[PDB]
From a paper:
Chromatin association of the [name]–[name] heterodimer is critical to promote homologous recombination repair of DNA double-strand breaks (DSBs) in S/G2. The [name] RING partners with the analogous region in [name] (17) to form an obligate heterodimer. This is an E3 [name] ligase, with specificity for Lys-125/127/129 on histone H2A. The [name] Ankyrin Repeat Domain ([name]) and BRCT modules are direct multivalent readers of these histone PTMs on nucleosomes, thus forming a second nucleosome-interacting module (in addition to the already described [name]–[name] RINGs) within the [name]–[name] complex.
Residue numbers in the entry:
A (entry chain Cb): 39 to 135
B (entry chain Ca): 39 to 134
C (entry chain Aa): 14 to 119
D (entry chain Ab): 12 to 118
E (entry chain Ba): 34 to 125
F (entry chain Bb): 33 to 125
G (entry chain Da): 25 to 101
H (entry chain Db): 18 to 101
Amino acid sequence: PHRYRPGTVALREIRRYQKSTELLIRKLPFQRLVREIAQDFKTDLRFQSSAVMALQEACEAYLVGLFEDTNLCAIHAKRVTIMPKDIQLARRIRGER
Amino acid sequence: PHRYRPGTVALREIRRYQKSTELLIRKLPFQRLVREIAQDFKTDLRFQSSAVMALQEACEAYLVGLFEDTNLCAIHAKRVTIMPKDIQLARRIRGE
Amino acid sequence: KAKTRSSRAGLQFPVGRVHRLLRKGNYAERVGAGAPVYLAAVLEYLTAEILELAGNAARDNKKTRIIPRHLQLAIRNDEELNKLLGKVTIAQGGVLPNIQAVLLPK
Amino acid sequence: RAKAKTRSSRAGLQFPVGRVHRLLRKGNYAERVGAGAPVYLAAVLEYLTAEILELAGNAARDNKKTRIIPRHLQLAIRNDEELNKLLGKVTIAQGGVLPNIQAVLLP
Amino acid sequence: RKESYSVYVYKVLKQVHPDTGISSKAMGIMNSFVNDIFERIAGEASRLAHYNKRSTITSREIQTAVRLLLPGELAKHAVSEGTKAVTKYTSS
Amino acid sequence: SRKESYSVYVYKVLKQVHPDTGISSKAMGIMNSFVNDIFERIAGEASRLAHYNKRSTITSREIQTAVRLLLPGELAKHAVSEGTKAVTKYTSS
Amino acid sequence: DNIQGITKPAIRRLARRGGVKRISGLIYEETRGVLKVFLENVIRDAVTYTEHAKRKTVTAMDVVYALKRQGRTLYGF
Amino acid sequence: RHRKVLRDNIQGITKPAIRRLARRGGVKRISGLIYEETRGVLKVFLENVIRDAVTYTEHAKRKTVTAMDVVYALKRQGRTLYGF
Amino acid sequence: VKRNHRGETLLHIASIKGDLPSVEYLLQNGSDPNVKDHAGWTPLHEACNHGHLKVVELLLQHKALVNSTGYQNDSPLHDAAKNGHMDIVKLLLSYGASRNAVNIFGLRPVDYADGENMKSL
Amino acid sequence: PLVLIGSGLSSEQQKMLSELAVILKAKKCAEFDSTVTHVIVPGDTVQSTLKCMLGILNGCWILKFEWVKACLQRKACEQEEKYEIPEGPQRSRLNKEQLLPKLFDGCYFYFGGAFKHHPKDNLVKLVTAAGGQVLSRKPKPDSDVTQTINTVAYHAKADSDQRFCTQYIIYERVRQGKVWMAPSSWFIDCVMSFELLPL
Amino acid sequence: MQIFVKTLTGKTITLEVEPSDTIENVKAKIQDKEGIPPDQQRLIFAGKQLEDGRTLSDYNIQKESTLHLVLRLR
DNA sequence: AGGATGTATATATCTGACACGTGCCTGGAGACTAGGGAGTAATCCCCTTGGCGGTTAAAACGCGGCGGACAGCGCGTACGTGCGTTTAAGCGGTGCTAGAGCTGTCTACGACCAATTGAGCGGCCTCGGCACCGGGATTCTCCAG
DNA sequence: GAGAATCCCGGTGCCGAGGCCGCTCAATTGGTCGTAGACAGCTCTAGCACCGCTTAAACGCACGTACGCGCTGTCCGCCGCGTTTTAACCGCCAAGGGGATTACTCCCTAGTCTCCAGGCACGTGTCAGATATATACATCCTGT
C-alpha cells in the first residue's frame, strides 16, 4: 500500500475544478426541486428548458461567491476550516439580513 | 486622588453620543477639503451653502456604517479592539 | 355645479395633478382613465401609516410636534418598512441605540 | 435622383445608423430626437465591441485554438482593471472562475 | 411658482392624529418620500407595458407594479384600498 | 421579417481587427446582449438629463454627458474622442 | 421532501471551486437553507410576470427579467 | 493673472473626530494605526462624488455647484438623501 | 515660518505690494529668499509680475536664483514678457536671464511679446 | 533636523547606528517616510535596492559607513561632503538645490506583460515619485488621444528626437510615431545615472 | 517629413511636405496623385475642419501623423 | 532514492457545427413644406467671496499603571483517504393532446379644442411651545474592610 | 459607605408655526373623430408521461494523523486626567459676478409619396475540434 498524507488531494481537486466549465450539481434533482417550490403559487404550471438551465447557472454563481467570502473570513481568524459562523457573518455584512 | 478604571468612560460616551443628533466634524476644515478636490477637477469654482451641508451628512453616515461592520469583524476573532486589518476585510466583502 | 374628481372618489390626495404628471413625463403614449385613482390611494395609505407611527413615538417623549428624529425612530422598528427604505439616509437624524453583549462589564 | 450612399458609410462606421435612430424615436425617451445623436451612439458602441473582441483573440491564440468560446471572453473581461468595474454585476454563462489559491494553504 | 404636496399631508395628519403639528424641517422629508415612490411605481409600470407590445398604461399595470415593489404584508392592504377606491369611482 | 439581431455587424469588426479567427454560436449571444445593455443605460441617462433642465429634445451634448457619467477612468477620454470624429465627417458631406 | 437531491459531494465540489480546503460537519444544512430562500424569491417574481400576460408557461425572458430586478443581470440568453 | 492652489488639508480631520465617530459606531478600544486608513477611505469617497457633481454643473453652462447636483450624484452612486 | 493657507510666507505678502522698508527689515532680520508656494512661485516671480522695479533690485542683490521654474515651467522672463514691461527685462538680461529656456508647451519668451523693442530681443 | 535610514547595514552595525543617532539625539525611521533626509549605504557602490533608488530620486545625501566610523571616533556633530558616493547620485542633489524640475517631467508610461525579476508596484511607485504619469490602456499610434498631446519633455538632449515624442511602452521598428518600446534595463539604468540616455 | 492621408474606402496615401506650407499646396499634391479635382476636398485632423489660408505648423502637425480626407459630392 | 501514481505530450480517426450562396419582401433614403422650440441680447437685484476682531471651547503634549494581545506547550476527537457494494442518472427511442402565435372584423375609449370659474400659492402678523438656566434627588461605581 | 454624574422642577425670554386675503393660472364641463385592443377561429411546434439498459457516481465502514480549543506567563501599547497653546464660531460692513426672467427673429425637425438596395430565412458542404491510444517524464514519500 501507499498513501498520500492529509492535505494533498484537496489541492489537486482545487486545481482541476478551477479550469473546467461543466455544470456541477446534477440536472434532474434540480428540476424536481424547482417544480416542488413553484407548485405553491399556482396550480398547473409548465416550464421550458432554457428556464431551468438559467436558474441552475445563477444558483451556482451565487453559491460560489458565498463560499469565497466565507473562506476569506475563516482565514482571517487564524484557522483553515470553515464553519457556520463564517456564513452568518458574510451574509450579515453583505446586507441580506 | 479619585480615579476611574479603564473601561467605564467609554461606555458612557457611547450612551451619550447614540442619543443626540448633531454634526461632529468641524465645518471649516471640511469646506477647505471639498474646495481642494474641486480645484483639482476644474478651475475657479464657487459653492452654495447647502452643498457643503449635504456632503457633510453623507460622508458622516458612510463612516458610521463602515465602523459598525468593522467592529463585528473584530469581535468575530475573540478580541475587543479594532486594528487596520478589519477595515480591509469589510471593504473586500462589501464589494468596493 | 362642479364636483371635483378627488372628492367623488373618497380620497384626500389629488387626482388631476397626478394625471398631468403621468401624461407629460414620457412614460407611454396614452394614460387610461382609471390610472391615477389607484396611485393616489396607494400613496395616501403609505403616508398615513408612516405619520401615525411617527406621532406615537413623538408622544412617548413628552412633546407635541414631529422632528426628524421621530421619523428615524419610527422607520427602523417596523420590520416591513425597513426593507422598502433600506438605502436611505434621513438628514439630521441619528442611529438606534444598542451596545453589543460582550463589551459589557462582568 | 442621384445614387444612394447610406449614412453608415459617410461617417466611416460599421454599425447601423438607421436602426439606432428608429429605436431612439419609438422607445419613449424624449419628444423629438436630433439629427446628430445616432452617429455618436453608433461610434461609441462600435468602439466598445472592438475593444473587447481584440482582447478575446489574444487569450484565444494563447491556448492554441482558432475560435472564441465564452471562457475566453470571461478571462479577457475579468483580467482588465477598467472593463471590470463596468461589468461588475454580470455573470457569463458557461464561463468559469479565475485561478487563485490563497497563500496560507500551500505546503 | 413651485409646487409641493405640503397641504395634503396636513389633512391626513389632522385626521389620524388630532392635536399635533409638523416642523418645517420635516415637511421636506415627506415631499421627497412621495416623489421617490411615485417615480419607482410609474417607471416599473412603463417597463411592464413596453415588454408586451402595448401602448396604454392601464390599471392592471399599476396592480402588478405594486405587487412587485412593496414587501409582503403591505401589499394586500394596498391592493384592497386601491380596488375599493376605483370601484367607488366607477359606480358613480 | 422576424426578430432582428446584431450578428451581421460583429463579424465585420472581427474580420477588421483580427483576420484569421471565427466566432462560435453562444459567444454571439453574449456579444448580442452586451450591446442592448449599454444602449438602454445610455439612453435612460440622456432622458433624465434632458428632463432636469426643462428642455425637450435629445441632442449630441446629452449623449456626451451621459457617456462621461457612466464609463470609468480612461475609457471616457477615448470614447468621447471617437464620437466627435464621426460627427465632423458627417456635417462635411 | 426533495431538498435532499442536493447531495454531499455536490456541495463539496462547489466548495472546491470556491477555494476552500477543509469543510466542517454542520455546513450542509445552512447551504440548503440559503439556496431555498434564493430560489423562492426568484421564482415568485417570475410567476408574477408570467401570470400578468395571461399565459401558463414560464419562459426564459421571465427569469432574465426577474434576475435583473435585483442585480444579477445574467447575459447569455 | 497668476493662479493659487491649496494642498495638504486632510490633516484638519483630526484624531478626536475619528474617535467620536467610532463611539457612535459602537466600539470601545481603538488602536493606533486606524487613522491613516480612515483618511484614505474618506478621500476616495469624496473624489468619486464631487466628480459627478461638477459634470452635472458644467453641462448646464453654469459656474456654481448647487444643492440638487449633489443629490443627483448620490442617487447615481446608490445612496439616496432626503431633506433637500 | 508660520505659513499662510495658500503657502505664501511673509516675504511673499511683502513683495506682492511694494513696501520696501518692510522688506529691508525682514531680510536683514533673516529670511530665506528661495521658498516656493503650493503652486511653485517664488518672491522674485511675483515681484517681476506686478511691476515694481526696486523690489526686484533688492531681491537680486541678496543672492536669489535667476532661472528658477514654477507652474508649467515658466521663468521670470516669461512673465516679464507676457505682461509687458521695459526696465525689468533690461535688468534681468544684464544679470543673466536665460533667453533660450522653454516651457511645458514648447514656447520661448520671444513668442509672448508685442512691442517692437520687445521683439528686438 | 537630521533623520536616518539604513540600506544594508549589519545587525551589530544597526545597533551601532542606533547608538550613534541617540548620541546625536535625532529621530529615526524604519519605513521610508517623506522627510528621510539622510541615507547610509553599507558598501562603496550605489546598489540596486528599492530604498536607495527612492532616495536618489527624491533627493538627499548618500553617505558611506566611513562617515559612521568617523562620527563614532570624533564623537562630534558631523562632517559631510567628504564621503558622498560620487559619479551619478550627485547631480540629483545639485538639481534639487537649484529649483529645477524633476527627471521625468512630461513623460507617459505604460507597463504590459509578466514581470518576474522585479514586481510591479515597485516600478509604479518609482514612476510616480519621479514625476511622470501612468496610463491604463495601450497607446496605439493612430488614435486622437495620442496625437493631440503637446508637451515637450525637459531634461532631454539639446536637439534630438526625445523632445517631441514622450510616450513609452515598457516590457520585460523602435519608434512608430510618438510611441517607443524599451526594456526594463534601460529604465533602471536611467534612474541610477540621472540622465535620459537615448534609444 | 512624411504624412499619411486616409480615405473612406480604406486606403492610405503617403506625402512629403515641409513645415511651412499651406493647405492649398497639400490639396494640390493630393490631386497630383489621386485624380479628384482640388475644389471638392475637405481635410480633418483631431476633430476640427481645416481652412485654406493658414500654415501647417500653426495647427501643430509634426512628422508621422494622419489626416482624414472626405469629398463633398455625396 | 528508487518505486509507484499523475499529467503531458504526440498521432490516429470521425461526426456535427460554421462559413458561404441565392430570391425576395419590408424598412431606409432623396426632395419638399409649415409651424414652434431654442439661440441670442438686455437688464434688475439676490447672495457669494474677502477682511477684522474678542472670547472661550476644543485640540495638542505628557505621565504612571493596569488589562489585554501574541507566543508557548499538552491532550483527545472529528474529518481526510482508499475499498467493495447498491441505487438511480443519462441516452435513445415513440405517441400525444394542450397551449403559444397569427389573422380578420368591428366597437367602446382617450387625444384634442373652447369657455367659464374655485382652489392653492405668495406675503403679514401675532401668540404659545420649545430652548436655555439655576437648584435638591436620586442612581451608580470603587476602595475598604 | 463616600465621592462625581444624571434626572426633575420651576422660571423668563423669543422666533417660527398656524390663520387669513386677492388674485392669478390650471382643472372641470361639454362636444367630435380616427384607431388600438377584445374576441372568435384555424394550424402545428414543443412539453409531458413511458420503457430498457448500460455504466458512472452516491452510500457505508475502518484507521490514524494533523488541527481545534482550553491553559498559563510576560510585557509593550493604550486609556484617563491636568496644564498650556492654537484657531473655530459669532456678529458686522462693503464691493461686484452671475442666476432668473423677458422678447424677437430664424433655422432645425416632424410628416408625407416614392423607389431601389441591404439584410433575413433556407440550403448544402468541408474542416477544426472532441475522443481513444502508447508513452514520455515531473512531483510525492518512505527508508537509511
